[PDB]
Enzyme design. Structure first.
Site, PDB file in Angstrom:
ATOM      1  N   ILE F  71       0.952  -1.112  -0.102  1.00 55.73           N
ATOM      2  CA  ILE F  71       0.022   0.019  -0.140  1.00 55.73           C
ATOM      3  C   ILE F  71       0.845   1.165  -0.083  1.00 55.73           C
ATOM      4  O   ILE F  71       2.107   1.245   0.737  1.00 55.73           O
ATOM      5  CB  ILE F  71      -0.885   0.128   1.036  1.00 55.73           C
ATOM      6  CG1 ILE F  71      -1.516  -1.580   1.467  1.00 55.73           C
ATOM      7  CG2 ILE F  71      -2.053   1.094   0.926  1.00 55.73           C
ATOM      8  CD1 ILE F  71      -2.359  -1.990   0.235  1.00 55.73           C
ATOM      9  N   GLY F 127      -0.209  -5.253   1.101  1.00 53.89           N
ATOM     10  CA  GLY F 127      -1.489  -5.450   0.340  1.00 53.89           C
ATOM     11  C   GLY F 127      -1.067  -6.455  -0.719  1.00 53.89           C
ATOM     12  O   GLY F 127      -2.459  -7.017  -1.392  1.00 53.89           O
ATOM     13  N   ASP F 130      -2.675  -9.953  -0.550  1.00 54.04           N
ATOM     14  CA  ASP F 130      -4.323  -9.954  -0.810  1.00 54.04           C
ATOM     15  C   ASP F 130      -4.513 -10.103  -2.395  1.00 54.04           C
ATOM     16  O   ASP F 130      -5.469 -10.777  -2.714  1.00 54.04           O
ATOM     17  CB  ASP F 130      -4.885  -8.755  -0.016  1.00 54.04           C
ATOM     18  CG  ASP F 130      -4.469  -8.403   1.130  1.00 54.04           C
ATOM     19  OD1 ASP F 130      -3.587  -7.995   1.273  1.00 54.04           O
ATOM     20  OD2 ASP F 130      -5.354  -8.672   2.200  1.00 54.04           O
ATOM     21  N   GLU F 150       1.208  -5.528   7.397  1.00 55.50           N
ATOM     22  CA  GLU F 150       0.153  -4.884   7.758  1.00 55.50           C
ATOM     23  C   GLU F 150       0.432  -4.443   9.397  1.00 55.50           C
ATOM     24  O   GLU F 150      -0.003  -3.150   9.837  1.00 55.50           O
ATOM     25  CB  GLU F 150      -1.004  -5.437   7.954  1.00 55.50           C
ATOM     26  CG  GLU F 150      -1.502  -5.844   6.370  1.00 55.50           C
ATOM     27  CD  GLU F 150      -1.739  -4.632   5.421  1.00 55.50           C
ATOM     28  OE1 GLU F 150      -2.200  -3.524   5.962  1.00 55.50           O
ATOM     29  OE2 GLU F 150      -1.643  -4.773   4.149  1.00 55.50           O
ATOM     30  N   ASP F 158      -7.125  -5.747   6.763  1.00 58.00           N
ATOM     31  CA  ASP F 158      -8.575  -5.586   6.591  1.00 58.00           C
ATOM     32  C   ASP F 158      -8.838  -5.773   5.107  1.00 58.00           C
ATOM     33  O   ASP F 158     -10.137  -5.435   4.819  1.00 58.00           O
ATOM     34  CB  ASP F 158      -9.213  -4.441   7.298  1.00 58.00           C
ATOM     35  CG  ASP F 158      -8.267  -3.417   6.930  1.00 58.00           C
ATOM     36  OD1 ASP F 158      -7.338  -3.413   6.101  1.00 58.00           O
ATOM     37  OD2 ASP F 158      -8.472  -2.084   7.665  1.00 58.00           O
TER      38      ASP F 158
END
Lengths: 281, 281, 281, 281, 281, 281
Positions: F71, F127, F130, F150, F158
């Site tokens: 991110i 991220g 994911d 994270e 999340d």
């Protein structure tokens, strides 16, 4: 006449008739306001009731003019308006602990194998709805009314109203109407919606009939009565196929009981089930 | 006039009108008591009904004075009071098999794609409640009453009463009251609680209207009617989001039917849906 | 007086009173028939409503004689009767996409945090039932009637009727009776079954009371009202134990609000909750 | 040496050692191709095995060069390529019935309380994967390989491969790779992915060790072994919290057994558990 | 150096390094046998740990030669072999209470928000598997081995082995092999199956690395670490779609923390996360 | 050579071979940092891919040295550190909307019926996990490593890491170890844990094999391949019994395809499945 094991300053538990416990909120001056003492005593009280072998039915009523006035704002203001925590994340953990503990106050009513009968006279405001919605059977007087005061206070119902009220009546349109507007639902409207089973002229007649219902339940087999509630609660939270599997696994042991022999023997004969005595459970 | 494929000594299945089967309990002398023969024949009967393409609706009624007298204690005493097994663990396996088999008797009613209509006249005691609670539509006469006799016998309802009765009516307070006390719920109270859809003066008027309702269902598209029940049953056991997904996967094939072309053509015109014929399903 | 952000050729959204949006179906000539334009506009409209901070309540009514005439067969015939695809498998994928998109039209009503109130006057046929069954609160006039026309058309209800109608009323016997026969259920019968909350003499009185109810909801705390709907919807699809966990995690943040301070301050005093102003959500 | 109750033309069930049944596919000429006869016989065979009290372990192997050659396309072509039904909707009902019946062929393996051990030698193609994925314990030889041939045939695996294969191994990346490309996974790769528990040089050594494992299982308490599988299967389909509740209800009866007394007595002493005999279950 | 709040006769809790608690079984003479005292103390101990704000990681090890010798048969023989109850039904209620209480001993480990690290040296037999299977991270020495002794004792694992062991490793074939045969799984095989994360030459090296891992966890943000475990546990018992919804509701409050500001500030700079101090949780 | 319908400033979608799309992150200068533009473009891109009939497989790779740097803190700092809202409750609603939108970025990858293959070279931090955990098949080079950054940033994952990572590998002990400590897991360790299916010497060899795998998938029947993924995803979130029911309802339409006729015809003959052409889906 107390239990006498049940001694509390916010509850009065009196053994009435036989195998019937009458748990009575005992704060008439504060209209049975649920202060901090009340929440912890209910958990202690209904844990003893579950362990109590002699008790077979439980009746919850209230003292004073009304059943309950809901949550005591004065005591609970400090917990919500003045929480503990450096920032929001710490506060959220602190608040979630408080919410979970207060939910446990009403879970023990549902987890109690003995049936619970609610006798509501006068107002039943706010958190008192969670008290009766966790009960198996709900009775009310002519002057009783049920109100979900949580929205007026400024918070969503997080102790059991929004989780059990839609699951105890079918008129979901009324549930949304009550929750969103926090209006008072009188006894006559409550009976039509199925929140209560019967309506009585006053508290005295309602209390006598509620205890009479508890006496009838206590006459039945404690194993059959206790097993019925466990499967009824399980069937609510699960599908039909899973519930049928669970009751098969549950009853494969509960069928091997002396109660079945005696109850069938009484049923085949003309003797009433009240005469035959059953062992403690 | 039999099916004539349906030949049983405890059931009488007569083909009435068109695409309508009238399954009738046929033990008036024993008040339609559910003996060992009854349990196995019901599984055999409703398996054939599901495979039957011509049948589109099913009506369940009873012979004699009353719909049914519940479980036959004399025959079922041997299974419970005298089980097979050296110790408790072996007995539990033996009992669980019996319970599972008896649950299958009422599951086939629910698993039957054809709609099932229950015509209850006279008493409907004990296990008979499971018979009607598995039906899609429940009718009753003025003298009919429903009783959960299981607790009086001494066991929790393990054949479907505690698993479907709370899921067919919304007044959960009444369900607990009925199950725990085993009291008789008359027809007028049953209609108010939503257990039945209509109440008729007697069996003759109820039976005629029940068959008239089945004829109306048979007039509709068999694909649409059968698909409706499957999605209605699935929606009961699952959340809204999952059920919406399932019906999308279910209807992506059932929409490609000639019934849709003809039904729309009839609907656009003034022709009644009873005139248009549909293929066997 | 439009939103004015909401400009549609099949809907008319007018801001009424304060924090209340009146979404009105606007095809009186076609009796509010749901054509292809209607399905996409509803998704667009209620997505904007959710993002709208000022709006706190939504009222859905209809123009012309009746609330809605169901699905427009002329437009939707091409999609079903003339699908795209070389063989059945390709057609099934094409049809499933169409069904899923049309389900999204009514999901956004449920997913909208603001409460939705349905004002039904005149007929509510076919797909219109899904429109009102997704609403939180349902009102109707004396002449209103609800009909599940899907079976008459020749298909099972795949847009939400079979998935939400059994979950908004408890009389499951009636639900099967309505779905299988596609008969019209008048307003008086609807009130008895709990599909609607109130019945009014005509549209004008029903509309005024529906907007009055929306104004009362808007007076409450927007955080408390919005959180109440989220937990009410979640509790429907999940068990009691899971829902109690979810509301604890949900409320641990929503309790830290200025609305709680002001609402309690107003409640402790004699000031009405309508006077105290709350921040936009 | 047959059961001798198990007499089938596509299976050969021989009782080996004690309390151990060796179910052997018996079509070496057709490489154990699963024709129409095979599907119905497996349901009949494993229903008798469950009712068999003496049997405590089941070993599934294959005759001829390979374990199985998958589904017999010649016989199953007629069912899929030439279905029964006027239009697509009727065909879909016909196909769903066939798919459900074929799924029941492998469900009975899972529903059989006795443990099932799979001895795979040679290829295990297509539907044979469902045969071994339903088994509790999987063994393979050095030359064995597993292939999901369904995609090559042109259909998604609808008999159990896509439903149990992701739930028996953790390498979900491999599961997608196998299913999407239908490639052959050799024995060495199978052991690394956890599909099999052990790898043996050839069929003779694998079969001897598989029967030795079954003999060790049969030595244990039948109540404990059977209960272990039931809870292991239940724990797979449910959460930890629900599974812990279910095992508490399951073991409250199975703990009251003579096996517990004898097994503890043997364990406290130096006697091996093979010496102590247990009652039939 | 004790907690010193943690004073138990079967456990020794010593605060090691900073924000790390070392819970150590302290019955070397009885090989850490789980007697009646052990079960109640574990519930008391891990309830205090959850309330402990300073503690951020927990390490579970054992004293003496081996980690644990499983359940103490001598003490637990009386509960199972000599239960309380007039007949089987009363005994089943008595046994279910005992089973539920013993399950609570290992639930508190899972419900503890702080991560739990298991350091296994020597044997880990019987109920000790439930002790480590409830831990987040499992370490072992070269001589360690894991055995599910329950079947040998004569009962199915009802304290957590059958409910969590299949959910912590993917090789389901091995899980059935271990449970059904009660064989010992050495450390090398355990690492291959994924039951443990690392294998160390002996207890001293394993213990040092386990505490080093706990120190690394304690260096991170307590809010992020605690939230991670809650979502990891929730994701295990729920689908992906539900878990994504839950974490969105969970993180909408936990994102508003000072830890996020400081951790990002440290990450943007070259400072290690060990330097930045975080508030108590 | 673009799609050319796919034109994005953070993604480069190039059509490679036939029926294969190569979605490539196109920010080498910022190491494929996920800025605000990236999140919305991925939703737009994979929505078009799903509607694309010609596309049958999708390959996700990255440009520059590494697959992705996680991110982008600079852009996402404003959303988290400077939210919109008067108090905490308003902020929580604002944050939950942001979290839900970012989760939708990775949901569309899972909801895309076409298989998705991840080609990871260089680092895959934060991220990016994911991104690959939502892919069906994961490949990596020798220098690749996966890190859950994270916790180091200061928040729980999340966007999908904590929800899909435990469900794609079986070594749950490693999952907790990775999440809690945010350490880097190299390619060799990743292969052992089953996160990736294969490991290749460098990006060029990995990319060629990934596209070769996609070409092999595209050769198969699009109906069979697409249906396989839908049932594989459904089986993950549901029990075996429900998944078997769903695939029966899903395949009753997908079996009626011309692909089944041609694939069987090719399989019966010696022709390779690459030769036979299938219709667009």
């Amino acid at each position: 006449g107390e239990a006498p094991d049940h001694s509390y300053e916010s509850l009065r538990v009196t053994s009435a008739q036989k195998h019937v416990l009458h748990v009575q909120l005992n704060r008439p001056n504060k209209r049975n306001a649920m202060n901090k003492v009340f929440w912890r005593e209910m958990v202690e009280c209904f844990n003893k009731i579950s362990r109590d072998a002699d008790c077979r039915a439980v009746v919850i009523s209230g003292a004073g003019k009304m059943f309950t006035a809901g949550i005591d704002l004065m005591d609970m203001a400090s917990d919500i308006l003045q929480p503990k925590g450096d920032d929001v994340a710490r506060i959220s953990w602190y608040l979630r602990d408080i919410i979970t503990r207060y939910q446990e106050t009403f879970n023990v009513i549902e987890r109690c194998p003995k049936p619970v009968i609610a006798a509501v006279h006068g107002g039943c405001i706010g958190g008192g709805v969670d008290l009766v919605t966790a009960c198996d059977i709900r009775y009310c007087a002519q002057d009783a009314f049920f109100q979900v005061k949580e929205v007026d206070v400024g918070l969503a119902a997080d102790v059991g109203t929004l989780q059990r009220l839609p699951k105890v009546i079918g008129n979901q349109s009324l549930v949304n109407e009550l929750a969103f507007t926090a209006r008072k639902m009188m006894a006559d409207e409550a009976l039509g919606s199925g929140l209560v089973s019967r309506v009585f002229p006053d508290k005295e007649v309602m209390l006598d009939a509620a205890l009479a219902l508890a006496a009838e339940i206590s006459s039945k087999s404690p194993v059959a009565v206790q097993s019925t509630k466990v499967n009824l609660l399980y069937s609510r939270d699960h599908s039909v196929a899973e519930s049928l599997n669970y009751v098969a696994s549950w009853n494969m042991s509960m069928l091997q009981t002396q109660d079945l022999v005696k109850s069938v023997q009484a049923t085949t004969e003309n003797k009433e089930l009240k005469t035959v005595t059953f062992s403690k459970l």
